[PDB]
């Protein structure tokens, strides 16, 4: 999705920035520009000018509260962002060939707990989807254009579980139905879905959320959706498993055997909570 | 061409995963949206051409000694990882990790990645480890370890100050193309 190019929010905090102080841009970089790159540059450029030791870089994304900030120092907050679309805006970016034409909304996610931590347990994890609206729109005459409005949305931890599941259900879905196939990308997605070794695995998600049928049916429209997303997930793992059996040679036969074994072990456990 | 299989091995709590998820998502280690699944994909540009790098994340526990080398076949390049302020983990590079990937994959290139290098030049951890008779790993004492071990080279980075982060992955791709 860098047919569109790479976009970061940039906030300028400090009197030493002259007219930039309390202004906030969305920068447009070339495609696949990495967070290291821009942050090297903006610190490098205000290093050369104010002195290396006053350029402090806000390695954050929570909105800047003006107080906590040493007023002597020059603070730059940098956050990667993605172009944000209507469901109507998006649909038309499917069917007509030119798609880079009204980029004025940009989205970032920042994770939290009520605790004031960034990350928590599966049931403690919150996410704030923020939508930035810029004054003018890309593509534009300048490469940065500043932010005029801002919208925050909050996802209850179960809504967060859903977005995690949906993205990886689709990551499988894509790595399966694609020509010519990519076996390494497919096994990479597949193993990290059914045969996880490091993170929490998808089972613990069903367990933490799908174990009790909630009363409050405003929360039921959540419980159900996660229940159905596991159904689509478990259908896309099969398909992917099947498809990897085609693509492998002899060396990866024990590999696939374990990936298979890992799956039925999981669908086993899943089935109580899904049905 | 196609995806590059890069398998990443090393002790848990060198923050091996912490940096995989943060480079690939363009996030600081404080703001990445955490997940439950494993492995991460990323497109790096290199000489104007864009290569995609499949990042295979592996538990550093003994408990997985039996299962882990199942990912090793068809690997293109290895990132062997240690934290420069965890000399337990830099010993497990000589005598666990590099032997393991070179036993199943003798012709496959690997890299030495030091990580968490911000805590090296950090006052509170230096004498914290010295207060059990240990100094962090200087790049000197790691650069030779990699020449000793016929690694492609040594690289070190910080997930947090992003320093040398891009270099780690540029070299991994490059090493896969030779």
CSV table of C-alpha atoms in Angstrom, one decimal, chain A residues 112-113 117-127 155-165 199-210 226 230, chain B residues 33-37:
chain,number,residue,atom,x,y,z
A,112,UNK,CA,-2.7,1.4,26.2
A,113,UNK,CA,-4.0,0.0,29.4
A,117,UNK,CA,1.1,1.2,30.4
A,118,UNK,CA,1.4,0.8,26.7
A,119,UNK,CA,0.9,-2.9,26.6
A,120,UNK,CA,-0.9,-5.3,28.9
A,121,UNK,CA,-2.5,-8.8,28.9
A,122,UNK,CA,-4.9,-10.0,26.3
A,123,UNK,CA,-7.8,-8.6,28.4
A,124,UNK,CA,-6.0,-5.4,29.5
A,125,UNK,CA,-5.0,-4.2,26.0
A,126,UNK,CA,-6.6,-1.1,24.6
A,127,UNK,CA,-6.0,0.7,21.4
A,155,UNK,CA,-11.4,-0.1,20.8
A,156,UNK,CA,-12.3,-2.2,23.8
A,157,UNK,CA,-9.8,-5.1,24.2
A,158,UNK,CA,-12.2,-7.5,22.4
A,159,UNK,CA,-12.4,-5.1,19.5
A,160,UNK,CA,-8.6,-5.2,19.5
A,161,UNK,CA,-8.6,-9.0,19.4
A,162,UNK,CA,-10.9,-8.9,16.4
A,163,UNK,CA,-8.7,-6.5,14.4
A,164,UNK,CA,-5.7,-8.8,15.1
A,165,UNK,CA,-7.6,-11.9,14.0
A,199,UNK,CA,3.7,-14.9,21.2
A,200,UNK,CA,0.4,-15.9,22.8
A,201,UNK,CA,-1.1,-17.9,19.9
A,202,UNK,CA,-4.7,-17.5,18.7
A,203,UNK,CA,-6.2,-20.0,21.1
A,204,UNK,CA,-5.7,-17.8,24.1
A,205,UNK,CA,-7.9,-15.2,22.3
A,206,UNK,CA,-10.9,-17.5,22.1
A,207,UNK,CA,-10.2,-18.5,25.7
A,208,UNK,CA,-10.1,-15.0,27.1
A,209,UNK,CA,-13.1,-13.6,25.3
A,210,UNK,CA,-15.3,-16.5,23.9
A,226,UNK,CA,-15.0,-12.7,17.4
A,230,UNK,CA,-12.4,-17.6,14.3
B,33,UNK,CA,0.4,-2.7,18.5
B,34,UNK,CA,1.1,-6.0,20.2
B,35,UNK,CA,-0.1,-9.2,18.7
B,36,UNK,CA,-0.6,-13.0,19.4
B,37,UNK,CA,0.8,-14.3,16.1
